[PDB]
């Protein structure tokens, strides 16, 4: 129903909402009427047996409004839980040149299948982190990109930097671990009997904790030394391979 | 929940050159009583706090990329947060908030969980200000901060703020000589027996070795950390235990 199309691509997986705690006797019509305010519905999936469903709306904006408006609202004695659906066809990409843009990444990955979005993750100064996200329309397109970039060498720019493609890690930093669930542990009462505190010089917990911190600091130093050791190995490889291939030199063979 | 917090604060860019404060407030009148408003006329952007997170989310979704006297507005949540790790599975969002509240007002505290709702042992604590966040960071770095009876020192680090929404648009890329050199060759799968393939395949082997070595460091130090409890229980003595 939107007069101006929000963009080139609509009803993407970033426009998909998860709705939990539906009533036992939900119907598709009732489910669609819940979202009627937010334009023409796209794909609808309802698990009537398990009390949840999915809907795609036309735009990310409409999904954000629906979530904000419908989350924690009553339906026949149940508070609806509305969340953005976790993306089923998303990949992490890393080892990106700093001169790879969102559009280059999308253009590149579009060869694997229809692509919804690609983004280069930037730091607080707008500089590339060398990492990105690619969101495909279909799981098979994501699987082909994952398999082909794993087996082969996919290059986006002049500098030979193979794109490293991994499953996108999707952890929950919205709901987290509420005290309602934590309390179900037997030893919870015993763990909370001592309040948050600074440990004091001379106590067992202070001495244990300072030694633990010293091992953690040693682990940090060793992990940094490994990165430095492997950077030197990668720079030595580059120099040896340039020489093997006579990169700065004409040679018939 | 608290009202008009830092998580209710919106950035609005691409304001008209002759924007007025009242014109700016009328933009957000739909969303009830405005909180603190500030306009940087210098650069054509403004900030407004709305009553709740839900209202700020709706305003951002309804006003972003809408026209205002010539240009399309850019509406973002305005961006004081700390990473926390070595959390025990007993730590809830509410315990994290209660514990870190002594350093200053908390915007959000959450324990990061997996899709089965199990603690990852990591969390995020967002304060209303960078000073309160620096204080909490300095105190927990220097000192031993404990949340529960079983001693596990909370390991606190500034959370680096990353952008996965706007990212790096082609229009904002600097077209300097490194851009020109990099863009000269297009996206491709390299061919066996070329320098770019053979080097890249050896690079991947080294990158895999680096991951395995990092994992071995983590496993060697996990063994050391686990042994420490028993070693400490055996070796601990009070300061007055052996005095002449
Ligand atoms: Zn002492
Ligand atoms: Zn080969």
Please report the number of helical segments of chain A.
Answer: 7
SS-based class of chain A:
alpha+beta
- By CATH, the superfamily of the domain at 90-167 in chain A comes out as RRM (RNA recognition motif) domain
Count interface residues per chain for the largest interface: A-B, 101 and 99 residues
Alpha carbon gyration radius of chain A: 25 Å
Assign the CATH topology of the domain at 90-167 in chain A: Alpha-Beta Plaits
Q: What string, H for helix and E for strand, traces the elements of chain A in order?
A: EHEEHEEEEHEEHEEHHEH
* CATH top-level class of the domain at 90-167 in chain A: Alpha Beta
Major sheet attributes of chain A: 4 strands, antiparallel
Categorize the overall geometry of chain A.
flat
Gross CATH architecture of the domain at 90-167 in chain A? 2-Layer Sandwich
The percentage of residues in β strands of chain A lies in 15-25%
PDB class: rna binding protein
Keywords: sfpq, dbhs protein, RRM, ZN, polymerization, nuclear protein, ALS mutation, RNA binding protein
Assembly: dimeric
Entry title: Crystal structure of human SFPQ L534I mutant in complex with zinc
In short:
Chain A has a domain at 90-167: RRM (RNA recognition motif) domain (Alpha-Beta Plaits). In chain A, 35% of the residues lie in helices and 21% in strands.
């Amino acid at each position: 129903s939107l007069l101006r199309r929000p963009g080139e691509k609509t009803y993407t997986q970033r426009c998909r909402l998860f709705v939990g705690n539906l009533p036992a006797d939900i119907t598709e019509d009732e489910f669609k009427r819940l979202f009627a305010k937010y334009g023409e519905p796209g794909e609808v999936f309802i698990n009537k047996g398990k009390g949840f469903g999915f809907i795609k709306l036309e735009s990310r904006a409409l999904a954000e409004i629906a979530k904000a408006e419908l989350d924690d609202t009553p339906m026949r004695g149940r508070q609806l839980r509305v969340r953005f659906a976790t993306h089923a066809a998303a990949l992490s990409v890393r080892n990106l040149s700093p001169y790879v843009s969102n559009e280059l990444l999308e253009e590149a990955f579009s060869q694997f299948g229809p692509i919804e979005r690609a983004v280069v993750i930037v730091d607080d100064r707008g500089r590339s982190t060398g990492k990105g996200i690619v969101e495909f329309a279909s799981k098979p397109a994501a699987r082909k990109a994952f398999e082909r970039c794993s087996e082969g060498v996919f290059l986006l720019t002049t500098t030979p930097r193979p794109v490293i493609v991994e499953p996108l890690e999707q952890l929950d930093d919205e709901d987290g671990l509420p005290e309602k669930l934590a309390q179900k542990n037997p030893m919870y009462q015993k763990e909370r009997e001592t309040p948050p505190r600074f440990a004091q010089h001379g106590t067992f917990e202070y001495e244990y904790s300072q030694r633990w911190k010293s091992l953690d600091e040693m682990e940090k130093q060793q992990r940094e030394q490994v990165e430095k050791n492997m950077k030197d190995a990668k720079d030595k490889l580059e120099s040896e391979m340039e020489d093997a291939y006579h990169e700065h030199q004409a040679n018939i063979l």
